[PDB]
Design a binder for these strands. Sequence first.
RNA 1: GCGGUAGCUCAGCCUGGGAGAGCACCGGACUGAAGAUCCGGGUGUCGGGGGUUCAAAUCCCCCCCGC
Length: 332
Amino acid sequence: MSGVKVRREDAKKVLELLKSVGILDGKRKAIRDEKYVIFPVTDTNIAKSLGLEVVDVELPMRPERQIYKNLEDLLPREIFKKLGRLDIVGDIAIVSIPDEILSEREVIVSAIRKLYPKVKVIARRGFHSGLYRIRELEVIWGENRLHTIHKENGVLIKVDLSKVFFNPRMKGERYRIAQLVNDGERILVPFAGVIPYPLVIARFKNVEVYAVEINEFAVKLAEENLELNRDRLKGKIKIIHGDVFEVLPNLPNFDRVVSPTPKGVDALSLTLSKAEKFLHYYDFVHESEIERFRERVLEECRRQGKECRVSVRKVSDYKPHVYKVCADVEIL
RNA sequence: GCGGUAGCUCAGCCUGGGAGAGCACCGGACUGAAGAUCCGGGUGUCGGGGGUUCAAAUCCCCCCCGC
Ligand SMILES: Nc1ncnc2c1ncn2[C@@H]1O[C@H](CSCC[C@H](N)C(=O)O)[C@@H](O)[C@H]1O
């Protein structure tokens, strides 16, 4: 808590000098008069070593909204070590609050609302289980609801996280798939959920996309999502309520197939059977098996009489040494 | 009348002086369950131009783009 006195004509030069060495105090705020300007500094010793006049005065603390804080900043060391990455989906804030530390859950709550004020629901995070891949979520703060509208890559996505699968992070993958698509192709997305992949693909390109999903409430909020985005999309989307393994054999074929396969499911043969130009097949593979995974894909390609180039890439960390991966199959 | 800030979603603007958050993305680590977790990295024309000022993301004017 101390300051720098500089002539107003030199105020800017001193300012960026202090930035250059790095002793300007961002927590406080600078006072000025017609004669001089005072800048708060972190260390006076290097201020005088640079040869500046150093003064001790009370400078106003800045509003907290203007102080750069992270989630580690506002939490004791121990329970931050225990946490617990934060993910925000619309109005819901989802975090993994470990079981040892739930008393500081309430302290945790404050931090999140100090970090994100516009969020109305804070929920504790479990795992994905069952066959709709719904994740275990319980609300530790706020409005007792698990549904909200979420913005991603320019689209609106209605999600009730207690009845459907949705992961915000896959936004990255979605944009990238959206970029591989070319205008005019017909695309099939099995296991489409609340159609985030359709909505993003059609958001950035003029295509027709078929979406197949089995969860009836997921098709409900896919409907509502398409209504929500009707004036936003360049392409067209059609939603099919059904089982992929029953629905797909009766559909026509598609330029590109994007299969976010559910954990444990083998849809490689079917989805590849419905593709002529591109298949993007997601799977869960341990690192040391990744190359074998590729051979499996190549095997299936030649079982269908297709000539393909196959490249598999890591998409995300699923569990220790296991990655969510995608096989890009280019059919010739 | 509002809104345009990192790749996405957004704080910061009232009342001028640190380019920030979460996630994405890149690199690395981690044996049973895990759509995880750990460590490192900011990748920016604050839509653009002008004005006031020692100094503009912030205040004023004009232009562009979407409700
Ligand atoms: N046999 C089947 N037919 C159609 N959909 C299925 C299915 N088995 C599971 N699903 C659905 O496929 C989804 C897998 S997770 C959803 C992924 C979605 N594309 C997204 O990125 O959000 C789940 O919603 C699940 O309900």
